Amino acid sequence: VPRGSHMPPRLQRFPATASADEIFAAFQEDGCVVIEGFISPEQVARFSQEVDPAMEKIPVEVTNGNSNDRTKRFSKCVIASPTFRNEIIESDLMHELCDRVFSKPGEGMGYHFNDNMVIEVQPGAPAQRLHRDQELYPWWNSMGPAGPECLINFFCAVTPFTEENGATRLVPGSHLWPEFTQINERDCPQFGKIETVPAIMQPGDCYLMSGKVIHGAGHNATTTDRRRALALSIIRRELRPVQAFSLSVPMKLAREMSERSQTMFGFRSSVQHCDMVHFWGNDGKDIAHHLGLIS
Amino acid sequence: LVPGSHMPPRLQRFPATASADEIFAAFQEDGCVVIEGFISPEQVARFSQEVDPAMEKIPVEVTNSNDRTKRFSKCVIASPTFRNEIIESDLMHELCDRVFSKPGEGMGYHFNDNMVIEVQPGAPAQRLHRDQELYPWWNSMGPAGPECLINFFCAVTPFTEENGATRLVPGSHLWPEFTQINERDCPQFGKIETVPAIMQPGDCYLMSGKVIHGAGHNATTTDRRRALALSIIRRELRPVQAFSLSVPMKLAREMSERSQTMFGFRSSVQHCVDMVHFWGNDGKDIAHHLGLI
Ligand SMILES: C=C1[C@@]2(C)C[C@H]3[C@]4(C)CC[C@@H](O)C(C)(C)[C@H]4CC[C@]3(C)[C@]1(C(=O)OC)C(=O)[C@@](C)(O)C2=O
Ligand SMILES: C=C1[C@@]2(C)C[C@H]3[C@]4(C)CC[C@@H](O)C(C)(C)[C@H]4CC[C@]3(C)[C@]1(C(=O)OC)C(=O)[C@@](C)(O)C2=O
Ligand SMILES: O=C(O)CCC(=O)C(=O)O
Ligand SMILES: O=C(O)CCC(=O)C(=O)O
Ligand SMILES: [Fe+3]
Ligand SMILES: [Fe+3]
């Protein structure tokens, strides 16, 4: 920023080799932070090829205002992609960051997966409605910035992110506004005056975003760029996933998963303390016994 | 009644033939209400007999809210009366919708648990607690918070003050600050007047996640005090039981669609301009992949 200019909201950046407490401090202060090279170079390539057939079989709606107008969405990444199920979801850093946002000492893994979405904003797609992802859990806004974190997003780029192909518009620091509202002219005072920043990103980068950060896919201005992303939506264990992964992901794949990844997809329980109780358990036991996964 | 005797809080009681609006009005005022005859005596007695082998095989722990209390949750597997008729209580669904379901979204609730709770002779009293402490952030929203959880807590065997009927605190869903009930955080600690849910078999009380309560002390030598807790949460919250993974598909196929939704064999659509199936499969109902039409 040239001297005397207005400084736009800060969007720090870290290489995927940086410390967890470091990237977390940026997450805490600004609600978001980029992690360049979150997934390896060829890894993202091997992922993008693997889901390209499934993407290719998704028609595009040309409608209207909603978040599906010229935007393809696809969630069966575990089924359709070995690289994702074998490599990406086993990022030690990802878990290291989920432990800081969600887990409490002695209570095990405090988080699990909400969704695994590939989102490909088609050329000419209108800008997505501005929103907090925690609107998925409607009461959460009511708790304001003091509320605990329900949701974080590792929002990784598949094809590159530019200002023109509709990369995500971020509003850093909107996690600390004093009243969390929906973002429209009737409910949001600051509507029309919201300073957004685009998340310019190369394939394999990601931004870790809080469910409190206002954001949205921008308008894709191009004519050939299908702007593709991979969203790793991770929630606290007490919240329900939008994807019923433990009913769609075949048991064969769950047997190949780690313990922690079995916990992420609901093939394994976790114990909550208050008295104690396995959430998503089976009459006082881990659901994994009944599924043939303890041995 | 009593003789200038201090009068205890009133737990309102309605027969199961009362209008769901009259029971919901009581529930809103007090946070709890008794539904007499929520289940028929014939239904209760078949249920109790159908789970009873499973109850006998459960070792009593003697030493914590599991102290001399049996807790059994495979009600759907062990009991046809449960899955074929207790689950199909229309008054239960009337009341659940009035609490949880939003306009134009389908069912906004599902099952958290189906727990048989048999308080043994001599079992000590349970700590005072709100059931929404299961979702730890919920107390922070206070009494203006939305409902997260309700309990249809049914007497399977009689509930008496001696054998440990639940102690309830009506209107504790309206206190300005929702706190955990200990000496550090709860200013009223020790000073809280509870009342027991005196119930006959098949009766039940409907209770908010926001009401303070605990199982009473079982001061008898003979009464094993058996209850059935139908714990119902809203659709965005995680169940304590993984029913869709343990309940067999053969039993899912025989369920009504609203029962399939209760146990996670079927999705429900939430609206935010946008629409998403909660607990879905790549934009489609999970009931498709499961073969439930
Ligand atoms: C761990 C416990 C938790 C936190 C949650 C409950 C809870 C899921 C709360 C909601 C209810 O609708 C119902 C009946 C389904 C219970 C069953 C018993 C447990 C699982 C619990 C327990 O089993 O304690 C050894 C408790 O007794 C208790 C009361 O103290 C708790 O509040
Ligand atoms: C219905 C929608 C909901 C309500 C919820 C999200 C949500 C599950 C929220 C949490 C995120 O981590 C992520 C990326 C996984 C998305 C995926 C897209 C949808 C499912 C949604 C959508 O697909 O719109 C027809 C939207 O785009 C949106 C933003 O507008 C919504 O708020
Ligand atoms: O497509 C994008 O860039 C953002 C996706 C998103 O924010 C959502 O669907 O919740
Ligand atoms: O068994 C009772 O009467 C009380 C049980 C209860 O409130 C609980 O475990 O949450
Ligand atoms: Fe979003
Ligand atoms: Fe309770």
Q: Domain for residue B218, yes or no?
A: yes
Instruction: Report strand pairing: B13-15 vs B32-36.
Output: parallel
d(CA B277, CA A242): 7
Residues enclosing ligand 1, CB less than 6 A? A 274-277; B 65-66, 71, 112-113, 115, 129, 131, 133-134, 151, 229, 231, 240
Distances (CA, A) of A248 to A73, A262, B152, B245, B283: 17, 14, 31, 11, 12
Paired strand residues for A69: A61
The H or E element containing residue B155 is strand B149-155
The number of distinct structural domains making up chain A is 1
Q: Domain for residue A6, yes or no?
A: no
Paired strand residues for B70: B118
d(CA A169, CA A167): 7
Atom of ligand 1 nearest to the CA of B133: 32
- Which residue precedes each gap in chain B (C to N above 2.5 Å)? 3, 63, 272
- Residue in chain A closest to B116 (alpha carbons) equals A283
d(CA B131, CA B115): 14
Chain A nearest-CA distance from B161, in A, is 24
Q: For residue A27, give the CATH number of its domain.
A: 2.60.120.620
Q: Are A254 and A262 in contact (CB under 8 A)?
A: yes
Residue of minimum CA distance from atom 4 in ligand 3 = A217
Chain A nearest-CA distance from B171, in A, is 22
Query: For residue A274, how far is the Cα from the chain centroid?
Result: 29
Q: Is A83 helix (H, G, I), strand (E, B) or coil?
A: helix
Q: Is B220 helix (H, G, I), strand (E, B) or coil?
A: coil
Q: Which domain holds residue B135?
A: 13-290
Report CB contact under 8 Å: A248, B289: yes
Chain A nearest-CA distance from B222, in A, is 26
Burial label for B91, CB within 10 Å (0-12, 13-18, 19+), is middle
- Quickly tell me which residue has 């409608």 as its tokens: A63
The two tokens of residue B247 are 């309940």
Check residue B215 and report its DSSP letter.
P
Q: Is A117 helix (H, G, I), strand (E, B) or coil?
A: strand
Other CB atoms within a 10 A radius of the CB of residue B52 amount to 17
Paired strand residues for A117: A231
d(CA A13, CA A156): 13
Q: Are B211 and B173 in contact (CB under 8 A)?
A: yes
Q: Domain for residue A2, yes or no?
A: no
Q: Which of A135, A136, A139 lies nearest to residue B141, judging by beta carbons?
A: A139
Q: Are A20 and A38 in contact (CB under 8 A)?
A: no
DSSP conformation letters of B228-281: EEEEEEETTB--SB-HHHHS-HHHHHTS-HHHHHHHTSS-EEEE---EEEETBB
Q: Domain for residue B8, yes or no?
A: no
Report CB contact under 8 Å: A282, B246: yes
d(CA A205, CA B292): 40
Sheet of strand A151-157, all strands in order from the earlier edge strand to the far edge:
A13-15, A32-36, A206-210, A151-157, A227-236, A111-121, A71-74
- Residue in chain B closest to A131 (alpha carbons) equals B272
Q: Are A160 and A44 in contact (CB under 8 A)?
A: no
d(CA A282, CA A55): 36
Q: Domain for residue B1, yes or no?
A: no
d(CA A244, CA B279): 5
> Residue A132 phi/psi, 5° resolution?
-95, 135
Q: Domain for residue B5, yes or no?
A: no
For residue B265, give the amino acid letter.
F
Q: Domain for residue B4, yes or no?
A: no
Is the C-alpha dihedral spanning B232, B235, B238, B241 positive or negative?
positive
Angle at A20 between CA A19 and CA A23, to 5 degrees: 90
Q: Are B47 and B155 in contact (CB under 8 A)?
A: no
d(CA B259, CA B249): 13
The two tokens of residue B218 are 């079982």
**Nearest Cα to Cα of residue B125 among B215, B192, B226:** B215
d(CA B108, CA B91): 16
Check residue B126 and report its DSSP letter.
P
Check residue B176 and report its DSSP letter.
S
Paired strand residues for B118: B70, B226
- Residue in chain A closest to B181 (alpha carbons) equals A274
Torsion of CA B74, B243, B139, B270, to 10 degrees: -150
The two tokens of residue B275 are 């629409």
Instruction: Report strand pairing: B195-196 vs B32-36.
Output: unpaired
Q: Domain for residue A4, yes or no?
A: no
> Residue A189 phi/psi, 5° resolution?
-65, -50
User: How many C-alpha atoms does A27 have within 13 Å on its Cβ side?
Assistant: 23
The H or E element containing residue A14 is strand A13-15
d(CA A24, CA A6): 26
Q: Is B284 helix (H, G, I), strand (E, B) or coil?
A: strand
Q: What is the resolution of this structure in A?
A: 2.3
